[PDB]
């Protein structure tokens, strides 16, 4: 009788594995609702500041030519050209900023998108092994049909 | 019979004359520098109009409703804007331009968008040429609170005094390389006047005994052509280190500004041969066609 | 055929004496021949008429290769060829060497270079001057810069060789070993035009003499004194 | 004293040579020319920038939270910023500047960036007029004891950057100008090695009757003296040609625009008898050493 | 005090013969002297250190003054009017008339210039060339180029009249009437060393004679041919 006593704790142990890749798909899926939202967010903004460093790139081509020698040649007097300088050195920062920041952007962004790569590659991963877990319970949580089985054919003749 | 025995003589006239070799050399040097550097600064005068407009030309912006959609003037609201500025007798003729030709003629004008900056930003044109460049005070403000116009441009004023102190110094240079070379061609004669008096000895003695006639004058032209090159030589390199020292100061500041075209250091090579061909020319013609006569 | 010229006249731009009139000289085959005149007879004027570096104002000069009156400037140097000529300043380059000098007649002519110097130490010794061929002249004394000048021309064969006094820049007892070379070079074969100015050497050796006075020929006899 | 003797001699120096003299008369005006030019540029930077740095004022950049507040200055900081930089020596007027008010004239006097120019883009400013625009090396430096502010540019100096196209011009004149002085000085000092051997015979007449070592050099002198006064004033002329010319006509549009200080008969005049003055012992600094150590 | 010179060399840069090695030569007031030198022994250097053109190697130069071996080279124009030298070709500026060349020393010295038209036909007229003397030299045959060369070294009073050959290209008949033209030069005002090239004129008229062989004293007797 004991080709069946042998697995009887075994059933009672083979909770902590299907428990622990329950948790850790999980994990895996509660990072999944915030990885891709995080990543989502981080190409809108670009997204939303594409039409704007275009429109300030192509806003010089309708007669913005001032960054250089270029603009005394549009000055009619000293005066307006004294105080010219003022407004031209601030405003030569605003576009170098802008390039910056879209630098920075295109930086944040391609890094986003190689974080929800990694991402996407570990819940592959996760999803593998998890279905792995489930594979075999079919054959390993069937023990419990074979011991109900044998405990009636269990009597020693008949009883 | 063999070129090695004209080498030994020349030499011994370089060594016999020091100072009237040496000026030769800088005379030459600045006449070919000024010359070189007047063709390089029209050079820059041409090269820079295809970045900008001529003085016949005007320029105006469109709304996003016709430039963006329905980009071939086809529409009844491009027709009704297109030719009511025939309607004057001011134009001679319009172009066809659109948002399919924006960003092919946006590298030449603008040398910092060829990267991503973004697509479907620059509006359509049409630009048209105007026979009457003195109307422009008010042909640009007809359009001004009238839909289906974004803005206007007429950057035709205020260039052509930028053209004219281009061209202006371009012209000046090339007065003073002209009367430098005037000082020079004869100054070319009177090498080898000077080298007959400094050398009256062998020349006087293979006459005598009998020389032929294109060998009389050959120690006088071997040298000759050898100056010419070592003149444009040393303007050539003296062009340079007064570009890259005293002059890149305001030309490398022109790139961000995009008033200048793309002018390097390799632009002198497209005039090099035309100058090494020059020089001895200038050098040859003088120098050949004075001693006709005197033997 | 001899190599001779007749009636020959040279105006220039102020006529004046124009050097002569009417001459009818000749000059045979390796014949010795003097030019006597006065100080202004133009000897340098007949040399110039000879090397045909002037043309005649009337007549025609022959050296029996040409008519050289209306010769092409192209057959000139070809002239050049057969004709040598001294001067008083030996006409020296006073930094190349003795051997040098010599060898400056043949090398503008231009030949492969064994020819060059195939020649030049058999007309050297010939000269007299055996020696010193490695010398700068201006090291070298006043006697021989006169023979190494008339051991230039030397260098080919000259048909007809001509002279503007080697003479006068040269001492009577340093032109005894120079009168005489000048018949060492006559027996040879070739013609000098021996065009003295003086008259103590012209009756010395007794050779033939063309009178001259102011291109007037006193006297034309090709014989004796 | 027989001065007249002297001015037939050099007529017959100039008639047995003339070939060598009418290149050397051509290239010292050049030789000349070339400073005067780079002097009258120089005094044009120096003009212009003198007669404007008299409206040049300092600015001063805040920082965002204080310049964020309200268009009108009431907090303590503002006026703590205000009250402290009155009492100094240069600062004698500070208008404040708001942020609302850099979005008019910089729309009105400049009709572009209309829709990118962001609102918080332009801070409160402080222009500070100083009587010194010159010797503001202090004023930057005295900016530690003021806080809340971000940078200053070197308060208004785009004015010598703004001419640097013509600073590196004026230098690269002279320096292509003592080319030629080099160039001209070993001329002037070989001109006599040729012009005695045309001469050779009374200058040896002269020496063996026993004329003076100071007098045997004046007829080799003066021909230099008369020719270097002749270069500089046809090198003043042909200055002046070109310049009525040439430049006059890029600079008649700089009458109305008024940002050039210009030149004009008087400015050519002032420096035309220092131009004789350097060239006439130019001349004969290299026409006297030649003669007593080559003569 | 008296005005000669002696123990003089030259060596230049190559010895050899260093021109003189040990003379005592003395010359008196106006003394009518030759000079017997051949061409390879150096004549031509003695005359150029009476005109300290060229330093001494040794010995010291005295004409009319003081010792001129250490001579200052301010002092050295104010010796020169007193000393007029000739040389064989004429030395002649084409260009400037007969009377020009004539007037040309005494102008450059610095006078009065109405004395100098004073004593022109007063030397013009000594020389015997009084007569075309508005010609070009070119003009003037080559008998009389010596004629204005004289006289040109003879416009003031000075002491000697040294003369390196001033015949040589002419003729005997030619130089008769300049070597008895200094006759009268001598006998009247000044001392002359016509330095002689040839011995035929030599032992013609019977003077002094001052043979120089290689800077040796061979004959000096003052009497005689
Ligand atoms: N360059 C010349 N142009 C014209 N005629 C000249 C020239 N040279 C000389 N004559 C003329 O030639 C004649 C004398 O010539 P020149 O004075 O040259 O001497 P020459 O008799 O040839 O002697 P030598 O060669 O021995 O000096 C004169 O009639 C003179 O006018
Ligand atoms: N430039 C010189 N360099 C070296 N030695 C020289 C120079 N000039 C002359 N001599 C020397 O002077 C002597 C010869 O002098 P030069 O050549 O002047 O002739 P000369 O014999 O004085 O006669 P002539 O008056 O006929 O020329 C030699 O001893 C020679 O070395």
Redesign the pocket.
């Known amino acids: 009788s004991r080709q069946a006593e042998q697995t009887t704790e075994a059933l009672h142990s083979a909770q902590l594995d299907l428990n622990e890749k329950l948790a850790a798909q999980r994990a895996a899926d509660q990072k999944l609702a915030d990885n891709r939202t995080a990543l989502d967010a981080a190409r809108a903004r670009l997204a939303t500041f594409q039409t704007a460093v275009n429109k300030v790139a192509a806003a010089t081509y309708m007669g913005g030519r001032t960054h250089g020698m270029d603009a005394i040649l549009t000055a009619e007097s000293p005066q307006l050209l004294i105080d010219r300088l003022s407004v031209q050195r601030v405003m030569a920062h605003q576009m170098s900023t802008q390039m910056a920041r879209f630098k920075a952007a295109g930086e944040q962004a391609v890094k986003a998108e190689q974080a929800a790569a990694k991402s996407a590659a570990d819940a592959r991963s996760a999803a593998e092994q998890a279905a792995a877990v489930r594979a075999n319970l079919q054959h390993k949580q069937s023990q419990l049909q074979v011991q109900i089985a044998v405990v009636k054919s269990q009597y020693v003749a008949l009883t | 019979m063999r070129f090695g025995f004209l080498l030994n003589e020349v030499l011994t006239g370089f060594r016999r004359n020091v100072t009237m070799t040496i000026a030769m050399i800088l005379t030459t040097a600045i006449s070919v520098g000024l010359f070189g550097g007047g063709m390089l600064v029209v050079r820059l005068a041409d090269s820079s109009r295809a970045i900008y407009l001529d003085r016949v030309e005007s320029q105006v912006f469109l709304t996003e409703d016709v430039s963006a959609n329905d980009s071939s003037c086809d529409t009844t609201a491009c027709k009704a804007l297109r030719e009511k500025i025939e309607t004057r007798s001011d134009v001679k003729a319009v172009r066809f331009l659109n948002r399919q030709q924006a960003y092919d003629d946006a590298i030449r004008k603008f040398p910092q968008f060829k990267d991503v900056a973004g697509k479907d930003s620059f509006p359509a044109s049409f630009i048209v040429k105007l026979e009457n460049p003195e109307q422009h005070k008010d042909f640009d403000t007809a359009m001004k609170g009238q839909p289906g116009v974004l803005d206007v441009l007429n950057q035709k004023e205020l260039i052509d005094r930028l053209f004219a102190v281009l061209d202006g110094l371009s012209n000046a240079a090339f007065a003073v390389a002209l009367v430098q070379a005037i000082g020079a061609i004869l100054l070319i004669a009177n090498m080898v006047q000077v080298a007959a008096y400094t050398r009256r000895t062998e020349i006087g003695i293979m006459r005598l005994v009998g020389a032929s006639r294109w060998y009389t004058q050959l120690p006088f032209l071997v040298e000759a052509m050898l100056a010419a090159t070592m003149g444009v030589g040393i303007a050539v390199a003296g062009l340079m280190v007064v570009r890259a020292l005293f002059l890149e100061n305001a030309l490398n500041q022109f790139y961000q500004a995009n008033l200048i075209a793309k002018v390097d250091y390799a632009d002198i090579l497209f005039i090099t041969p035309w100058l090494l061909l020059l020089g001895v020319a200038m050098s040859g013609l003088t120098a050949y066609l004075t001693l006709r006569l005197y033997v | 055929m001899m190599i001779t010229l007749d009636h020959v006249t040279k105006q220039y731009k102020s006529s004046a004496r124009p050097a002569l009139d009417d001459i009818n000289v000749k000059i045979d085959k390796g014949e010795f021949v003097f030019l006597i005149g006065p100080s202004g007879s133009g000897k340098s004027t007949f040399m110039r008429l000879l090397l045909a570096a002037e043309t005649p104002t009337s007549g025609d000069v022959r050296v029996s290769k040409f008519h050289v009156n209306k010769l092409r400037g192209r057959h000139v140097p070809k002239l050049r060829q057969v004709i040598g000529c001294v001067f008083q300043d030996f006409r020296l380059l006073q930094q190349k060497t003795v051997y040098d000098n010599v060898a400056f007649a043949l090398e503008v002519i231009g030949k492969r270079t064994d020819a060059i110097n195939r020649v030049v130490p058999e007309v050297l010794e010939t000269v007299g001057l055996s020696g010193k061929a490695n010398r700068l002249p ?1 090291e070298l ?2 006697g021989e810069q006169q023979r190494v000048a008339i051991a230039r021309a030397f260098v080919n064969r000259p048909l007809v060789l001509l002279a503007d006094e080697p003479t006068g ?1 040269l001492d009577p007892e340093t032109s005894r070993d120079i009168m005489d070379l000048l018949e060492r070079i006559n027996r040879t074969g070739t013609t000098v035009l021996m065009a003295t100015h003086d008259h103590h050497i012209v009756d010395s050796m007794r050779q033939r003499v063309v009178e001259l006075s102011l291109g007037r020929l006193v006297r034309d006899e090709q014989r004796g004194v």
Do not use: H
């Open positions: 201006d004394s006043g820049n």
